[PDB]
Amino acid sequence: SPVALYHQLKTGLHPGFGFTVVRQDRFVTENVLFSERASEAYFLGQLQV
Amino acid sequence: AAPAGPGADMQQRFLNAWRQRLAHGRVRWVAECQMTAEQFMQPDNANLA
């Protein structure tokens, strides 16, 4: 039960079934960047006050 | 407690005297059920401090 199992983990007894843990991680990486020439248009424009 | 009366009835004093504040909570020791480092952890031991 939610209480009948609660004795069994806190005292350290295996209740005949198991588990799988799942976690999430995050990293900070570095990159290089390659493109060929003229792969994009990139127009340039007017300024507005 | 200091003793009172004969020893012959002294249980039935203390049986009825602690009939109330015995089923109230728990005693300070519960750690016979506690494994080691369950005392070192912040939950489950209010008596850690």
Side-chain angles (χ1 to χ4, degrees), chain A, chain B residues 1-23 25 27-34 36-41 43 45-49:
Chain A
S1 83
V3 182
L5 188 272
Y6 180 74
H7 294 92
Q8 306 172 1
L9 290 186
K10 294 290 287 295
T11 321
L13 193 144
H14 187 84
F17 78 103
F19 295 102
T20 171
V21 184
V22 179
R23 77 182 70 179
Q24 179 63 254
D25 193 89
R26 190 173 181 87
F27 293 106
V28 172
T29 76
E30 292 173 353
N31 292 318
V32 303
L33 175 65
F34 176 67
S35 180
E36 304 289 331
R37 59 184 288 273
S39 66
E40 196 74 16
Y42 287 112
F43 295 94
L44 276 71
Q46 284 288 325
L47 288 60
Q48 298 296 112
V49 289
Chain B
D9 58 347
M10 190 176 285
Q11 311 165 10
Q12 289 78 14
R13 275 78 172 270
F14 292 156
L15 267 291
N16 290 110
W18 282 267
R19 195 259 170 274
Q20 292 301 107
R21 58 260 176 92
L22 182 141
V27 293
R28 183 258 173 87
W29 64 267
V30 77
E32 299 297 322
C33 297
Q34 290 183 357
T36 184
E38 294 173 350
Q39 171 161 355
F40 286 161
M41 73 194 296
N45 190 5
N47 295 322
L48 179 64

